[PDB]
Amino acid sequence: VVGLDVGSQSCYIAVARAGGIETIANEFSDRCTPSVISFGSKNRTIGVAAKNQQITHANNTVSNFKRFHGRAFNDPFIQKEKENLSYDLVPLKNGGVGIKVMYMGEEHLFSVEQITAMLLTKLKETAENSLKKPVTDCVISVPSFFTDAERRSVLDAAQIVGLNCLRLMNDMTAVALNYGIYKQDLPSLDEKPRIVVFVDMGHSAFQVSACAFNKGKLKVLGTAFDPFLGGKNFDEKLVEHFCAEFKTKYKLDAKSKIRALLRLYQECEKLKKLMSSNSTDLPLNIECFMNDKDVSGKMNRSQFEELCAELLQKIEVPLYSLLEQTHLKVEDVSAVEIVGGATRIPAVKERIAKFFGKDISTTLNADEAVARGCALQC
Ligand SMILES: Nc1ncnc2c1ncn2[C@@H]1O[C@H](COP(=O)(O)OP(=O)(O)OP(=O)(O)O)[C@@H](O)[C@H]1O
Ligand SMILES: [Mg+2]
Ligand SMILES: [Mg+2]
């Protein structure tokens, strides 16, 4: 049974092997498969070869589509999202979200179920190349805020592939189960349960849960979330900043050309990630940005944090929500464990730590924890 963490930006694959849980590496020997599909004239590509083409083939490269599951085109959520995409979003005949691209010489209209199914197919093939056997049974991750329609949409995708999804697993339940199996020296059943808070901020959302653990027993006490706050919001802030800085210094409007704006998003995200390990002034350099002009600017962590002041304030809100629901007090919590790509942002970690009055723990592998939990389920 393969565990599949299908993220809006990246995917991971895990499976129970002899002894424990292993992540499965792909044809680039990587655990991480970008959630990106590129449609060419002779074929299509999925993963990093698609992602590497995202500027060159921007109109026919599809990404960040996970949050379209179970959504109507007319939803203000989708109307907003639509504006930032390099590819065409149109309504399907049933009102759902349609993805229009040029493919095998012809115009194609895809549902999100169909797009996700193309991604699932690659992951399935990846697992089969490593295990040297057919893969059918799987567990697929879903955010803990996904509604029943959004979940059914993901199941519909898996059925298109011919996968037998035994279970859609809540990301935070994935993480909890992972912890519950791997954490050493949990309390005995005859001891006071250990209350752990899990925080997962990915590209598109912020999720938090509280769980009580004993050896062989897990109880989820509550979950909270901001489905509209993730790593990408921070990218957006940097992009808006440099877009204006470049209008001033170079009189170039990045917003006017989509492939320049995309490239600006790429650079700002790279910059964001680097500021997690480097606090000094860091270069942003984009060769031949537009009108053959090279552009340049700089940024450091402290300035990034000031720019993202309002976003960082939003971090404590789901934490407050969690306590409100569970009636837990921070002193009840033994540890705060982080997982996911964007929780690593030092200002985000700091806000969490200050809220619970505890240092942040990193017992689990932040990138792999969800897939590993999915692989544990069955
Ligand atoms: N070291 C780092 N510092 C800061 N941000 C990072 C770092 N590594 C990854 N990120 C950010 O984390 C996000 C990706 O997180 P993750 O892989 O958990 O998302 P996902 O699971 O694909 O998406 P979603 O949770 O929205 O489905 C991106 O915004 C990325 O820029
Ligand atoms: Mg995720
Ligand atoms: Mg792990």
Rounded distance from Cα 94 to ligand 2 centre (Å) = 28
The best mutation among 6, 9, 204 to test binding of ligand 1, ranked by most ligand atoms within 8 Å of the C-beta, falls on: 9
Cβ count within 10 A of residue 72: 16
Rounded distance from Cα 105 to ligand 1 centre (Å) = 34
Across the strands, what pairs with 91? 97
Q: Which ligand is nearest to the CA of 9?
A: 1
Rounded distance from Cα 202 to ligand 2 centre (Å) = 5
Shortest-distance Cα residue to atom 6 of ligand 1: 342
Experimental method: X-ray
- Are domains 1-62+119-187+362-378 and 188-229+315-361 of this chain identical in fold? yes
Q: How far apart are CA 81 and CA 323, in angstroms?
A: 31
Cβ-in-10-Å burial (0-12, 13-18, 19+) of 107 comes to: exposed
Cβ count within 10 A of residue 321: 16
Domain ranges of the chain: 1-62+119-187+362-378, 63-118, 188-229+315-361, 230-314
Q: Between 3.40.50.1110, 2.40.160.150, 3.40.50.10540, 3.30.420.40, what CATH number should domain 1-62+119-187+362-378 receive?
A: 3.30.420.40
Q: What residues contact residue 30 under an 8 Å CB cut-off, 6+ apart?
A: 48
Q: Buried b vs exposed e over 294-313: b needs ≥16 C-beta within 10 Å?
A: ebebebebeebbebbeebbe
Length of the chain, in residues: 378
Ligand 1 atom nearest to CA at 276: 3
Residue 145 Cα distances to 315, 329, 339, angstroms: 16, 23, 17
Ligand 1 atom nearest to CA at 66: 27
The best mutation among 273, 279, 312 to test binding of ligand 1, ranked by most ligand atoms within 8 Å of the C-beta, falls on: 273
Q: Amino acid identity, residue 332?
A: D
- Give the pairing type, strands 97-102 and 33-34: unpaired
Across the strands, what pairs with 62? 37
Phi, psi of 30 (to 5 degrees): -105, 140
- The topology under which CATH files domain 63-118 is Defensin A-like (3.30.30)
328 near 322, Cβ under 8 Å? yes
Rounded distance from Cα 367 to ligand 1 centre (Å) = 9
Ligand 1 atom nearest to CA at 370: 21
- Give the pairing type, strands 293-299 and 360-361: unpaired
Cβ-in-10-Å burial (0-12, 13-18, 19+) of 282 comes to: middle
Report which secondary-structure segment, H or E, holds 36. Answer: strand 36-39
Give SS3 for 153.
helix
Q: What residues contact residue 254 under an 8 Å CB cut-off, 6+ apart?
A: 239, 242, 243, 246, 247, 260, 261, 264, 289, 290
First to last CA, the chain: 7
Q: Which ligand is nearest to the CA of 368?
A: 3
In the structure encoding, which two tokens stand for residue 261, read together?
Answer: 């704006």
Q: Which ligand is nearest to the CA of 371?
A: 3
Rounded distance from Cα 133 to ligand 1 centre (Å) = 31
Within 6 Å (CB) of ligand 1, which residues are found? 7-10, 66, 202-205, 230-232, 269, 272-273, 276, 340-342, 344-345
Q: How far apart are CA 240 and CA 255, in angstroms?
A: 9
Q: What residues contact residue 231 under an 8 Å CB cut-off, 6+ apart?
A: 9, 201, 202, 203, 204, 269, 272, 341, 342, 345
316 near 208, Cβ under 8 Å? no
Q: How far apart are CA 100 and CA 73, in angstroms?
A: 13
99 near 109, Cβ under 8 Å? yes
Q: How far apart are CA 157 and CA 159, in angstroms?
A: 5
Query: Which alpha helices (H) appear in 13-111, and where do they start and end?
Result: 48-51, 76-82
Q: How far apart are CA 156 and CA 158, in angstroms?
A: 6
Closest CA relative to residue 322, chosen from 241, 162, 237, 209 = 209
Q: Which ligand is nearest to the CA of 362?
A: 3
Q: What residues contact residue 169 under an 8 Å CB cut-off, 6+ apart?
A: 139, 140, 141, 142, 373, 374, 377
Q: Which CATH architecture has domain 188-229+315-361?
A: 2-Layer Sandwich (3.30)
Shortest-distance Cα residue to atom 28 of ligand 1: 203
Shortest-distance Cα residue to atom 4 of ligand 1: 273
Q: How far apart are CA 3 and CA 109, in angstroms?
A: 29
In the structure encoding, which two tokens stand for residue 131, read together?
Answer: 């295990």
Distance of CA 182 to the CA centre of its chain: 23
- Give the pairing type, strands 217-226 and 282-290: unpaired
Q: How far apart are CA 12 and CA 23, in angstroms?
A: 7
What is the resolution in angstroms?
A: 2.0
Q: Which ligand is nearest to the CA of 206?
A: 1
Give SS3 for 352.
helix
Phi, psi of 109 (to 5 degrees): -115, 120
Rounded distance from Cα 339 to ligand 2 centre (Å) = 9
To which CATH superfamily is domain 230-314 assigned? ATPase, substrate binding domain, subdomain 4 (3.90.640.10)
149 near 156, Cβ under 8 Å? no
Rounded distance from Cα 304 to ligand 3 centre (Å) = 29
Give SS3 for 307.
helix
Q: How far apart are CA 209 and CA 199, in angstroms?
A: 7
Rounded to 10 degrees, the C-alpha dihedral 63/154/163/373 comes to 90
Across the strands, what pairs with 168? 140
Rounded distance from Cα 369 to ligand 3 centre (Å) = 4
Cβ count within 10 A of residue 257: 15
Query: Which alpha helices (H) appear in the chain, and where do they start and end?
Result: 48-51, 76-82, 112-131, 148-161, 171-182, 231-250, 258-274, 301-307, 309-314, 316-326, 346-356, 369-377
Rounded distance from Cα 32 to ligand 1 centre (Å) = 12
Give SS3 for 303.
helix
**Can you give 190-246 as a three-state secondary structure string?**
CCCCEEEEEEEECCCCEEEEEEEEECCEEEEEEEEEECCCCHHHHHHHHHHHHHHHH
